[PDB]
Symmetry: C2
Amino acid sequence: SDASGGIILIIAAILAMIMANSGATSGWYHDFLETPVQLRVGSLEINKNMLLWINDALMAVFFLLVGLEVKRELMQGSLASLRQAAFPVIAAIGGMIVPTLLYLAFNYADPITREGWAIPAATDIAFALGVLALLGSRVPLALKIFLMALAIIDDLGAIIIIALFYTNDLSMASLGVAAVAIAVLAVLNLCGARRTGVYILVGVVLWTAVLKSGVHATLAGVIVGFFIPLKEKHGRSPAKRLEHVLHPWVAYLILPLFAFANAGVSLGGVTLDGLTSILPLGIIAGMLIGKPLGISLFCWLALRLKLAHLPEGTTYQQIMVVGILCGIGFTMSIFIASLAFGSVDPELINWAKLGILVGSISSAVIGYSWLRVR
Amino acid sequence: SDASGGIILIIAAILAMIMANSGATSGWYHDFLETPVQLRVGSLEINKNMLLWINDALMAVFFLLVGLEVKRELMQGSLASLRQAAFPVIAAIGGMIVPTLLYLAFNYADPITREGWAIPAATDIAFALGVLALLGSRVPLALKIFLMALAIIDDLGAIIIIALFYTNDLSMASLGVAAVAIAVLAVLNLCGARRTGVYILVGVVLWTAVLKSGVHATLAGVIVGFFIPLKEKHGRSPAKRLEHVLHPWVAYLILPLFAFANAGVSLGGVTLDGLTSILPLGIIAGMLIGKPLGISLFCWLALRLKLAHLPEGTTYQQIMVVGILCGIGFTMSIFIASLAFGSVDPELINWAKLGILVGSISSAVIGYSWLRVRLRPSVEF
């Protein structure tokens, strides 16, 4: 059903552009998005934008799904054996190094915009598999597995690194409750409980605990995902089931809603044709050249260094085209930018949005054409 | 599994007495329970206690289940055919008039305390089916059906009436969003979507909408339940499945938690032996005498007026004892009181807590004893 998810996501995003551009609505849009939301429990005060609660919740859910999927892969999929997994793993850590270094060389010594290094290293899984299904039955399953693997390794990678990078903000209290929640998840797993709702509840406790950090509130859902039992011991599996239940939500609701909230950027406000500012052009360079070159190069080096490829997908032609398709960070990149530029500046977020819009919509159209003939 | 639900409920409530009495903890308990919680969306300012967000959530869920159940009954159970349902229904509207009138005649003309009329008219379904399950295989299923139907008709009844009674507080915006949400549930049913999470979501939107009224945020879950598709048309059913998923939660988590939060009352603070104040004794009389007499009398009158009884349960002996067992309002009576007195007084709530604690723990024990000697004994050899 990843065909309809793509079109509903693109309808949502385009509708968001229309929302944030046309004058009659583009005021309501922003006054809604930038509206202060704050909760007070006695002396406890948490305050964020509408956009920050929306983002933290939606990405919590999304990365709950990603957690489930990456576990499934790590134990029962393309990421289980050290043999099969080598090719996507190498293709990923090479598909992040090149985009980052091509954006950092393009962003030499700017302590503000340095921090957005993990922006080109994103890949909107939904939009990648969204354009990949537009080709239809001509598309092999090794390809869809490979791409859906790359997206996750890279995105979870970026989230993890950025999580380890900004720690200056988390209180000892929140860290304590976080630790005890994660502990409860662990003990609950090793004592083996089928009932998945409990894992979700404890999970929400963890989320609430680490709420003052978008990357940690996101990483919460991943922790929860990792800690839901997989084994078919029950006769049925709870993680597989929950993933199955999630997939249509996060595809028809969560992602299109996030896109509707975070992909809107004003062009009717300002569109200076000089998209050469180090964020737009550094990002575009990091995505349109960084992704395919990284993937392809590290795949040459992969093949040389004894490590073979994923069966019946032409390694020279199709793999590199997928490498281009990874150059559409669309939604995921928007989030990363909304993590690296949310606290620093309202206008760096928008030029990043523009830069990744250009870098995404182009690489999806460009990547499409080189693939419709293969 | 209502045998372990009962004991976990009583362990919860007893632990709540312990919590609310011993000096070393009963302060933390109250500063936790009365802690202000408020949410601000630009100009939107919504504030309650800990206890009110807790109560509204828990009762929303509980009555989501109750809604599902009362629907299933209303179309496929003992409330479906106008024939069968006659006996429980008649047994109910009398088991509510008598408690109320026994409490209002005992609370004549005190505008503060009048409003707590529907307090004896409650029955803690979990506690009743809890004590009833202590008697074991001696207990016929017609009896548990009967009681679980009585509790529901009386409680949903009181919640409906009380919902109609206080309307003064609802802003027009909240009612607008409410109505449009309800309408979404309707159209969603009539276009038939098996996916049940959607109904739940729109339900939450409705809940948030009417949140400034515990009775309406409670009745919201009942609306949601009433609007989830029932037919086995899918091959499977969404309502039955959901209800089945709820049954453990609402019995192991929701109810015991609610008890732990709302059943705690101080005795080591004050226990003036004169529980003769019109609330304690009014409620006591409304539950201990109002419930059994109402049920039994309306059942005499039911049997006379052509309307028979539910099969193989001794209508004279057991029905009336179930009538007493309806007289344990514990958890539900606490909620109704916490609705009728919360805004007006924090100490009328506590004397109601006392009065219904007395009225409950007495009729539970009294009702037990007249029932252990009306069941036929499972012999062993």
